[PDB]
Amino acid sequence: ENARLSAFVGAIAVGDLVKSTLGPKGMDKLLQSASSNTCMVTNDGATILKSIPLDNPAAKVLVNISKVQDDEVGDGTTSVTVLSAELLREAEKLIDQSKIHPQTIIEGYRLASAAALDALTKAAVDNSHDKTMFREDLIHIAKTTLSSKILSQDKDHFAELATNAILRLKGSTNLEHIQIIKILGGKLSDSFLDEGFILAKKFGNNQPKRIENAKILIANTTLDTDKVKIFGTKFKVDSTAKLAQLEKAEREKMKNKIAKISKFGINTFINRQLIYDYPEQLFTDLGINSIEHADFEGVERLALVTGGEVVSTFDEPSKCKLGECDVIEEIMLGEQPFLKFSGCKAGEACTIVLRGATDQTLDEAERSLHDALSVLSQTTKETRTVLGGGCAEMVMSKAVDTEAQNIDGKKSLAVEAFARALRQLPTILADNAGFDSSELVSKLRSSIYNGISTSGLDLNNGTIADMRQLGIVESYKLKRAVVSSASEAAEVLLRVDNIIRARPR
Amino acid sequence: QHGLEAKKSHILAARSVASIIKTSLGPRGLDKILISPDGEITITNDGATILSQMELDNEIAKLLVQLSKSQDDEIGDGTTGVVVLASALLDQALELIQKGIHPIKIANGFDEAAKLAISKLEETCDDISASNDELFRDFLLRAAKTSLGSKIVSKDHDRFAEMAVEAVINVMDKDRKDVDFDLIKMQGRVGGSISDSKLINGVILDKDFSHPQMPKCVLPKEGSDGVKLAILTCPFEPPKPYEQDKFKEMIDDVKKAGADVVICQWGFDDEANHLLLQNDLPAVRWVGGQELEHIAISTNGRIVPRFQDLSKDKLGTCSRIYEQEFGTTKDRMLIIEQSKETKTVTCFVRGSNKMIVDEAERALHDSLCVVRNLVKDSRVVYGGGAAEVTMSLAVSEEADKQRGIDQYAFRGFAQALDTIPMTLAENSGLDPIGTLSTLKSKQLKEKISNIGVDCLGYGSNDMKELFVVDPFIGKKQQILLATQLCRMILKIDNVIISGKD
Amino acid sequence: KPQEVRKANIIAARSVADAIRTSLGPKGMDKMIKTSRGEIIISNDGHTILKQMAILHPVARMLVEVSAAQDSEAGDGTTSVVILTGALLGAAERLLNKGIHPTIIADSFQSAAKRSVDILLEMCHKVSLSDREQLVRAASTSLSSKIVSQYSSFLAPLAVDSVLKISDENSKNVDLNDIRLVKKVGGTIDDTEMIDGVVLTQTAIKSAGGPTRKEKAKIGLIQFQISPPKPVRQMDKILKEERAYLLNICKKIKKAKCNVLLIQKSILRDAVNDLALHFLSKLNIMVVKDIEREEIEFLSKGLGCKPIADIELFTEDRLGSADLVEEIDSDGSKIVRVTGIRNNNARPTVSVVIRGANNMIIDETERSLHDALCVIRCLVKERGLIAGGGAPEIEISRRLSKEARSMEGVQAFIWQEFASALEVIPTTLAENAGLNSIKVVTELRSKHENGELNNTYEEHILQPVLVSTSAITLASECVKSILRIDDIAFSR
Amino acid sequence: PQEVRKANIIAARSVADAIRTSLGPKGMDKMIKTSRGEIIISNDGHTILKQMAILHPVARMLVEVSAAQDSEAGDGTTSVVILTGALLGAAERLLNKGIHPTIIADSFQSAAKRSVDILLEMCHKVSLSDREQLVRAASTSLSSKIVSQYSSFLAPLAVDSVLKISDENSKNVDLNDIRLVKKVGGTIDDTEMIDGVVLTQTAIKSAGGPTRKEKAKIGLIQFQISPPKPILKEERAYLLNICKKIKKAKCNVLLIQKSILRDAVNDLALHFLSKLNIMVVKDIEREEIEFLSKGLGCKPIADIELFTEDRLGSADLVEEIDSDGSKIVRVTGIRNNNARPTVSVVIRGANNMIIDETERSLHDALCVIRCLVKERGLIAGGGAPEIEISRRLSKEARSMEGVQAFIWQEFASALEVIPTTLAENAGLNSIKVVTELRSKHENGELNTYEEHILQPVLVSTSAITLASECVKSILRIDDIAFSR
């Protein structure tokens, strides 16, 4: 009974110290010791929480949350605890007059956070305007990162491949969308950018090397010689020919798994393990080509470019997520066959093939390319801001109200409670500003409700003004960092039905 | 304590401990923070770790730790299942005492009720190899996905599902079906990510091969037989009841026998690394006595007591030895594999944080115990709460045909099995009473099947479409230990606690 | 904590049910209660215990109203209805811990009570009132619990023949308040006079001039009293005023053709003056005074007459009809009997006369024959009879346990707890008899599977079906009225 | 949160009201008895607040404000505490009206910037080129000290020292370069500027020491002349190489830092240095280590190998002035173009109580003159600048709007506390004197000029600026927690 109070009400008192310190006009706190002459006055939230000894065993959970946020960026650490405190404050009404399962409330936050991030993306602005000057400066920055690296030999050709590897993505800039192949017997100057998804291994023997109107399906199973370790078994049979009957009976059962594949109408199959000749020979009449040695990234990255799924099982026939590609071409370079795909539907990715003269040049070029692409990918999350001053906080409340329309009975009060915590951010910022927070937040919701999505709250004039004319913006990367940190921190706390005090070190 | 006192207190003492783990039961439960006194910090929902950390003076809850210690070797994942099931039997046993039934009748009454329910579950059980052979691979892959869904491992779970399949098979035989936990090594280090984790078929020893000039990869040396390793049970030092001359005599026995690497229990001097550097013969130092057995078994080696007893037959042979740099860690450990099936398997998992490594280590180790029970019995049953509902309806229906005093002991056993689906229904956000009546109605008028409580959000019954199966030997081991525990509790009518001096 | 206030009343209600539980059956444990006035009484009757218990608990007083209706309707089971009421309260404790609202608990009792009646009627053997051999053996077994045994054989047809005359057909509820047991000093048990017309509680005039007998008389009900006014030529002046006041009342009596009149008993002033008896003696008018106030409402029903407050409104239509009015005294009784009323609105109200020497005779006989009329009353309203001793309660718990799977939701679990709440009645009967509690209960489920209602029939134990039906019906409303109270406050 | 702030305001108001009685020379002095038994008596607000050992965390901020008050302006340490408490007393009714402290805090900073321009318009513009107002400024400031006739002689000494180091755009000048060396003996009439440098101690009084040298180099050396400390010729051989390495750089002035660890110069080394006429001055305090490294442009030298010629200064003539109980060594013509010449004046007198209070009196005289360096002009004290600001804010308060309009009314009322206290400490009626000053305000403005009472503008300017941020930071802390 007291575990819920210490995890909810007890966690508010921890966030109350950083509640009034948010913002440049926010208040300050005092840290006093026994001697009282060592004290100091500062607005830093991370210093106050770590300096004050906390006897509350549930308060130590929020300590590790601030440490993860500080690694990403040193700004917004205070806003993480404040936003997480508003979700725990409204959790009291989620119990007494609600009686809703806590995990269902957490699952409602994932549906609300999905619409909140999409609402901020459409309203996000950037300084990338006049890209002619912006795109030209991208190649000069990549050349500066080439110092001490073997790629410094040619700055123009090597940095040009890294420039087109970023802007042409039109999506997530993470390295998971970039494929790197290490090969031998060539020069680094011959490297080029190709989106055909080139991998080392080949597939098939008598099958043709060109496929038109291909249908790609991704699955993971072993259809050939399961139980790879035969040591220890005991085969009791009356004759030698009777021992092979069990292996022949498994071949007849393979038609059940092949029938589900043939009903999908796919000419291309993906397999991590090998395939026996008999199920492979039956694929010749159906024209099914199986690709082997897909590793892990090759399984996930193929589903991203072709719009597939990573599930290895079939839950129901004629229902699944299928991809496709126009042409599959197999070429040979460097005395090894290569696989170059063509015509992938909505395919967005790039593959930089590094051809070195030895193994030492391949490992140094791959590690140096990731550092060069990290700086170019950082420019997407840097300098890009959004309209602040209550604007972005209120816009997220509109996307939550959209999901609050069509909802079940359990998550109805959970999604609606999340919209109240979003309006608490401009309320607290207006508290230390010296003005009335209830009047500014109320008039802000009615204005953005119908039209005028760029409006915000002005701290100087204490009224609603255009944020584009005032020029008050906040970083978009900071918005996602706080929401992602608050979603993971509140996910553990709401699931707590009891508190186990940690052992002191 | 007396009869009118302790018998009433033993029931209330078990309900306080059982009610703590009822919230953490299932994948939707709570992950608790626990810190061992040795300095290890990890977060897991495993009941065997949570119950082991419980320190209390009540003798009723101490039997839970004693039972979970022996159950950890057999299964280890059924700790939360047995405690809740055993506490359900004590709840119905309290009412039988007030009716004038001796407590020994309750202990002997559950023995006939447990054995009768086993034969009823076997009739409705299905077999894997006797039905579909190609689905045997998918059964082992999706078994670990349920336990790993509550952890960060659930993102990469597709690749890690195959690693747990080969780790169990290597240490067991198809006919014998014997798996030892001491043969499966669970290790991990800080740094890197989980995507670089690979399976190791041999020991590790965390050796950097001393001076870096030594080759990091062992060559086959013109098609030789494996890679010969030396095992020495004697320390490196000159014989005592000239020191450089004795060093040249001991290295000759290694070169003549063909041992590439030398493993010893005691440290080496600085001159030893100078002579071994010219011959490209890496050395191994500070190896425990327990780890010496796993090397000779996997590499097919022998224990050589003396210096001159070396020979090609007593040297352990492996596939190859290579030193692969892992991230920025300066340890630069080794990986020793083997072509043939060995008895030693070492799991190697990396993580960006120390708490992440220990979180995924015990989560992956629990997946090895689930696969261990699946390969022990080819026949599996549908779990998720369907096993407790089906076995309860068989005992409750046959209770009317069995007369005598045990007639009421059978009704209490059927109602005690309903505690599991009602507990999981509360953790899933459903009515525990409404779901229990719903599962019994669908299995009676419609058709006989196994439908349990929904672990994931869905709109209706019949989880059989999701192909969620549990091992028969795993579920049978839980009801046997829960029945034996309930009998042992009734055999202690007095609590004797001595004072302190 | 609105429910914890009700939970405190449930625990206090279970303590009262457990106290009465030990008194069930003839072998039950008696309860000693010392009143504040100093009276010390003891008995095994649950209705008398709760009446003098003076319960100050507001919810616990509901058992008194149910026990009062239990004896007024069925007449038997006042102790068993308290045990059945406490059984549902004990099972409702585990229901509140699961988050079940008492409305579903109360609504499910309505469907459970109506279902238990239909199941009981299927195994019950329907009997008819045309067979007099069944009613004699039914009332004779109820008289075996009293000291009178060999003399109870003649009392069996006495209670049977009285009900069959007023039973008719489709009578539904039959009020037994019209049947009064007359207790007089003298006589014996074997001496009884039915006197189906009516029987009064008082004697006749022992003075001179009283006719004491009249043929073709009309008996009216007059609450007035003839007395001299009670708010020494002077002597005769008072006599002329008193005799004129007494004669003017008698003038309207002769014109109304009133042979027999009644006078309400008043201890304050004089009832009937001696001069008034001599005035009506010449007119051949019988006078019966000192009529008890309790019998005023009784005679206003069976006789079909109406009370006359004022002589001005007194008419002939308010009188009665009697063919013969005589005074027959066996020994010392001096009682007047009336036969052949033949009233259209009124019915044949029969008053049973009981004679005895010692005071303990007419007393114990009154309570013995009163319960015998209640058992016969149960057969009139609801036909059929079952074997007592908790035999049908075992099979009902077995059928409802299997039919509980047909339901769905929270209500399905209530049927399982309702079957266990019905097993407390047969368990208590085995405990109060010295037999092993759990051992006898297990033997009930074993034997009732193969056989049906099979031995109490050889032991002549017959419980009417209306008692077992009303016990479940009244308990469903009693437990409902409990859980529906969520709080209580001072109101005045 | 008000329970934390209101408890701190009331606690700080009682401290400000207690120091308020100490304003002026006629004010009520406060006594503080330390636990060790020491009792001090004085009207200085910086001394009272330092030895009071205040346990209130917010009230301790007045010590830092009083420290910066004397370091910047040099006067008004008591007045800045009164103005701080005046704003806290008027803020009690502000919280009762529902006013958020942000508007209260932001209005104090906006009013402090506007109050400066009001004082500059009413102030008289003066320049540092005229020595008429500069001499009379330091002469009248010494009327509060025992010195009377000698105050006119030290007036041109303080004026000529500041004007040389003030320049134009230098603005703030470090006061650490001004060191007054006091010694018993002599008198006030004997003064020497000695712009080169002045040490804190005498020279070697032993036999053989030249004590005077011409054209010598001065440098900081942390080494010490001692025998071997992990036979006569062995110790002299170890000391021979020490004096030989010094001769390589031609350093005739050896300054050894005072340390109780070992000795300074051995007696055997005195005969070696007597032939080369190398003067040595020992007992150099640790505070003078940083002082000598600035004006002389030298560097501290820890070891004998670190000693080089490039780190040595230049001294035209180094001699020991003969005086009773003094023996002061002077250095002239350091010839340092990059660093400005330091100002160090030797204070002499017969009684120990003379050279003590004289050193403190000259510190306040140099600060008032330094106030004209940052901002020229002066405003006569006695409540004139406090009342003049309230006169302009009367009509300006009506031009505001919102919550801030009421703050300007209470801001002018809090400024009247300073002239009210000055009238109370003089025995005159508080309100009666203030009304007479506002009555003549229609004609007279700054008129005290005939009484030779002058005050710099920086004192009145810094008192408002420091008190504005002080009270601003008080309302920022809404809670007090224990952190260790």
What's this structure's resolution in Å? 4.6
Contact predicate C181/C366, CB 8 Å: yes
A77 to chain B nearest CA, in Å?
Answer: 20
DSSP string covering D308-370:
-STT---EEEEEEE--TT--EEEEE----SSSPPPB--EEEESSHHHHHHHHHHHHHHHHHHH
Instruction: Find the chain D residues whose C-beta atoms sit closer than 8 A to any C-beta of A.
Output: 55, 57, 100-103, 106, 403, 473, 476-484
Annotated catalytic residue: which of C178, C201, C371, C456?
C371
Q: Chain-centre distance of CA B318, in angstroms?
A: 27
> Which one-letter amino acid corresponds to residue C402?
K
Position D89: which residue type?
G
Chain A residues near residue D478 by CB distance under 8 angstroms: 20, 27, 29
Query: How far, in Å, CA of C467 to CA of B292, rounded?
Result: 85
Nearest Cα to Cα of residue B362 among B7, B37, B31, B83: B31
User: Residue C338, SS3?
Assistant: strand
- What chains are in contact with A, requiring at least 3 Cβ pairs below 8 Å? B, D
A77 counts as catalytic: yes
What's the length of chain A? 505
C446/B contact by beta carbon, under 8 A: yes
**CA-nearest residue of chain D to A433?**
D102
- Rounded to whole angstroms, the Cα distance separating B343 from B167 reads 10
What tokens does D100 get? 């958020």
Are residue A401 and residue A323 in the same domain, yes or no? no
Distance, CA of C54 to CA of B82 (rounded, Å): 52
Contacting residues for C216 by C-beta, under 8 A, at least 6 apart: C259, C322, C323, C324
Closest among D31, D8, D9 to D21, alpha carbons compared? D31
- Read off the tokens for C457: 């029939």
Radius of gyration of chain A (CA): 29
Q: Does one domain contain both B311 and B356?
A: no
Chain B neighbors of A223, CB-CB under 8 A: 134
CA angle D144, D149, D154 (to 5 degrees): 80
**Which residues, 6+ apart, have CB-to-CB distance to A471 below 8 Å?**
none
The A216-218 sheet, strands edge to edge: A216-218, A268-270, A289-291
Cβ distance C326 to C371 under 8 Å?
no
Token pair of D420 as six digits: 């009210």
Angle made by CA atoms D105, D110, D112, in degrees to the nearest 5: 100
Q: For residue B40, what are the CA distances in angstroms to B52, B351, B357, D237?
A: 15, 15, 11, 64
Q: Which chain B residues have a beta carbon less than 8 Å from that of A226?
A: 133, 136-137
The answer to whether residue A427 is catalytic is no
Angstrom CA distances, B39 to A57, A502, B358, stand at 18, 12, 12
Domain D1-126+377-484 maps to which CATH number in 3.40.50.1820, 1.20.810.10, 1.10.560.10, 3.90.1570.10? Answer: 1.10.560.10
Q: How far apart are CA D134 and CA D130, in angstroms?
A: 7
> What angle in degrees, to the nearest 10, is found between the helix axes of A77-89 and A412-422?
140
**Which tokens is B309 given?**
């007893």
Rounded to 5 degrees, what are φ and ψ at B249? -80, -35
Q: Which of B403, B437, B440 lies closest to C446 in CB terms?
A: B403
Put simply, whether A495 touches B (Cβ < 8 Å) is yes
HSE at residue D120, side-chain half, CA atoms within 13 A, is 11
The domains of chain D are located at 1-126+377-484, 127-195+341-376, 196-340
Nearest CA in chain B to A227: B169
- Residue C449 with chain B: CB contacts under 8 Å: 400
Measured over the CA atoms of residue A378, residue A382, residue A386 and residue A388, the dihedral's sign is positive
- D196-340: CATH number: 3.50.7.10
Phi, psi of A393 (to 5 degrees): -70, -35
Contact B405, B201 (CB under 8 A): no
Q: What are phi and psi of A325, to 5 degrees?
A: -155, 155
DSSP H or E run through D19:
helix D2-20
Q: How far is CA D415 from CA C423, D22, D412, D432, in A?
A: 92, 18, 5, 17
- What is the DSSP-derived secondary structure letter of residue A455? E
Rounded-to-integer distance, Cα B16 and Cα B7, Å:
15
**Distance (Å, rounded) from C-alpha D119 to C-alpha D386?**
10
- CA-based nearest residue in chain D for residue A51: D483
Half-sphere exposure of A221 (CA within 13 A, CB side): 22
Domain finish residue from B320, B342, B364: B342
Question: Sheet holding B283-284: strands in order across?
Answer: B283-284, B261-264, B227-232, B316-318
Query: How far is CA C189 from each of CA B170, C148, C154, C158, D435, rounded to the nearest angstrom?
Result: 99, 9, 9, 12, 124
Neighbours of chain C (3+ CB pairs under 8 A): B
Q: Provide the token pair at D129.
A: 């080129």
B263 neighbors B230 (Cβ within 8 angstroms):
yes
Task: Give A250-255's long-range contacts (Cβ < 8 A, gap of 24+).
Answer: A250/B133, A250/B134, A251/A276, A251/A278, A251/A279, A253/B132, A253/B133, A253/B134, A254/A223, A254/A278, A254/A279, A254/B134
**Is residue B311 located within the same domain as residue B359?**
no
Give the number of C-alpha atoms closer than 13 A to the C-alpha of residue C202, restricted to the C-beta side: 19
Task: Find, among A453, A309, A352, the residue nearest to A142 by Cα.
Answer: A352
> In the numeric block, which tokens belong to residue D235?
């110790």
What type of residue is D26?
Answer: K
> What does D93-140 look like in DSSP terms, one character per residue?
HHHHTT--HHHHHHHHHHHHHHHHHHHHHHSBP--TT-SHHHHHHHHH
Q: Are residues A78 and A119 in the same domain?
A: yes
With contact defined as beta carbons under 8 Å apart, do A381 and A174 qualify? no
Same domain, B332 and B208: yes
DSSP C313: G
Chains that touch B (3 or more CB pairs under 8 A): A, C
Top residue of D106, D476, D480 to mutate, by most chain A CBs within 10 Å, is D476
The residues of B annotated with a catalytic role in the active site are 46, 79-80, 366
Our measurement of the distance from residue B190's CA atom to the centroid of its chain's CA atoms, rounded to an integer in Å, reads: 23
CA distances (Å), origin D153, targets B301, B343, D131:
105, 104, 14
Distance from CA of C23 to the nearest CA of B (A): 19
Distance, C-alpha C9 to centroid of its chain: 30
- Are A490 and A410 in a shared domain? yes
Report yes or no: A99 at the B interface, CB cutoff 8 Å: no
At residue D24, what are phi and psi to the nearest 5 degrees? 85, 165
DSSP B191: B
DSSP-assigned letter for residue B30: P
In this structure, what CATH number is given to the domain that contains residue A31?
1.10.560.10
Contact at CB, B173 and A231, closer than 8 angstroms: yes
The per-residue DSSP string of D64-106 comes to: HHHHHHHHHTSS-HHHHHHHHHHHHHHTHHHHHTT--HHHHHH
Q: Looking at the structure, tell me whether residues B336 and B352 fall in a common domain.
A: no
> Among the residues of D123-248, which ranges form H helices?
132-141, 151-166, 232-248
Measure the CA–CA gap between A99 and A93, rounded to whole angstroms: 9
> D: neighbours with 3+ CB pairs under 8 Å?
A
How far is residue B104 CA from its own chain's centroid? 34
Q: In what order do the strands lie in the sheet with D315-321?
A: D197-198, D328-332, D315-321, D213-216
CATH of the domain at A176: 3.30.260.10
Instruction: For the beta carbon of residue A368, count every other beta carbon within 10 angstroms.
Output: 19
Give SS3 for C227.
Answer: coil
DSSP run (H or E) holding A352: strand A350-355
* DSSP secondary structure, A150-191, as one string: GGGG-HHHHHHHHHHHHHTT-S--SGGGEEEEEE-SS-GGG-
DSSP B220-269: -TTT-SSEEEEEESS-SS-----HHHHHHHHHHHHHHHT-SEEEESS---
Instruction: In whole angstroms, give the CA distance from residue C431 to residue B99.
Output: 11
CA dihedral D99, D105, D109, D110 (to 10 degrees): -20
Domain count for chain B: 3
B206 plus B323 within the same structural domain: yes
SS3 of residue B455 by DSSP: coil
What's C126's DSSP letter?
Answer: P
Q: What percentage of chain C's residues is helix, strand, coil (to nearest 5)? A: 50, 10, 40
* DSSP three-state, residue D150: coil
Nearest CB partner across the interface for A502, out of B35, B172, B174: B35
Q: Which two tokens stand for residue D419?
A: 């002239």
Single out the residue of B381, B375, B368, B374 nearest to residue B468, CA to CA. B381
Residues of B in contact with C436 (CB under 8 A): 100
In order, the DSSP letters of A269-298 are EE-SS---HHHHHHHHHHT-EEE---TTHH
Scanning B377-431, the segments in alpha helix (DSSP H) are 386-398, 406-417, 419-427
- Bridge-based pairing of strands A193-194 and A350-355 is antiparallel
The closest alpha carbon to D314, from D288, D289, D336, D290, belongs to: D336
Q: What's domain C197-347's architecture?
A: 3-Layer(bba) Sandwich (3.50)
The C-alpha atoms of residue C368 and residue C144 are separated, in whole angstroms, by: 9
The per-residue DSSP string of B295-318 comes to: HHHHTT---B-SSTT--TTTSEEE
Cβ partners under 8 Å of residue C42, min gap 6: C30, C31, C32, C33
Cα B201 to chain centroid, rounded:
18
What's the distance, CA D126 to chain centroid? 24
Domain that holds residue B81: 1-128+379-500
Same domain, B209 and B194: no
Q: Where are the alpha helices (DSSP H) in B124-156?
A: 135-147
Contacts of C186 (CB under 8 A, 6+ apart): C330, C331, C332, C333, C355, C356, C357
List the one residue out of D103, D84, D81, D85 whose CA is nearest residue D94: D103
| Among D55, D102, D482, beta carbon nearest to A432 | D102
The domains spanning C1-127+384-492 and C197-347 adopt the same CATH topology: no
Q: How far apart are CA B117 and CA B123, in angstroms?
A: 10
Q: How far apart are CA C16 and CA C373, in angstroms?
A: 29
Residues A410 and A489 in one domain: yes
CATH superfamily of C1-127+384-492: GroEL-like equatorial domain (1.10.560.10)
- The helix (H) or strand (E) run that includes residue C325 is strand C322-328
Whole-number Cα distances in Å, D269 to D240, D253, D280: 8, 14, 11
What 3-state DSSP class applies to B58? Answer: coil
Residues D13 and D29: their CA atoms lie apart, in Å, by: 18
Q: Helix, strand, or coil here: B286?
A: coil
Contact D75, D368 (CB under 8 A): yes
Q: Going by beta carbons, is chain C in contact with chain B, meaning 3 or more pairs sit under 8 Å apart?
A: yes
**C289's tokens:** 């005074």
Cβ pair A502:B33 closer than 8 A: yes
Are the CB atoms for A338 and A330 separated by under 8 Å? Answer: yes
Where b means 16+ CB within 10 Å and e means fewer, D9-47 reads bebbbebbbebbbbbeeebeebebeeeeeeeeeebbbbb
Angle at C262 between CA C256 and CA C267, to 5 degrees: 140
Question: Do B50 and B101 fall into the same domain?
Answer: yes
C192 catalytic? Reply is no
Burial of D3 (0-12, 13-18, 19+ CB in 10 A): exposed
Q: In this structure, what token pair is assigned to residue D303?
A: 């070891």
Q: Which domain holds residue A115?
A: 1-126+383-505
Rounded CA-CA distance B335/B326 in Å is 11
Catalytic entry in A371, A402, A436, A463:
A371
> CA-based angle B353:B358:B362, to the nearest 5?
150
Q: How many CB atoms lie within 10 A of CB D167?
A: 11
Distance of CA A196 to the CA centre of its chain: 24
Write b or e for each residue in A155-168: b if 16 or more Cβ atoms lie within 10 A of its Cβ, otherwise e.
eeebbebbbebbbe
Same domain, residue pair B293 and B417: no
Interface of A with B in 44-83 (CB under 8 A): 61
Question: Tokens 């209770």 label which residue?
Answer: B399
CATH number at B374 reads 3.30.260.10
Query: Under DSSP, is residue B451 helix (H, G, I), strand (E, B) or coil?
Result: coil
3-state secondary structure of C442: helix
Residue B418 tokens read as: 């309903």
Interatomic CA distance for residues A496 and C370, integer angstroms = 67
Q: Which long-range contacts (CB under 8 A, 24 or more apart) does A401-407 make?
A: A402/A115, A403/A111, A403/A112, A403/A115, A407/A108
CA distances, A39 to each of A30, A52, A141, D55, D471 (Å): 8, 12, 45, 12, 19
Backbone angles phi, psi at B187, to 5 degrees: -135, 160
Domains in chain A, number: 3
The Cα–Cα gap between A432 and C30 comes to: 78
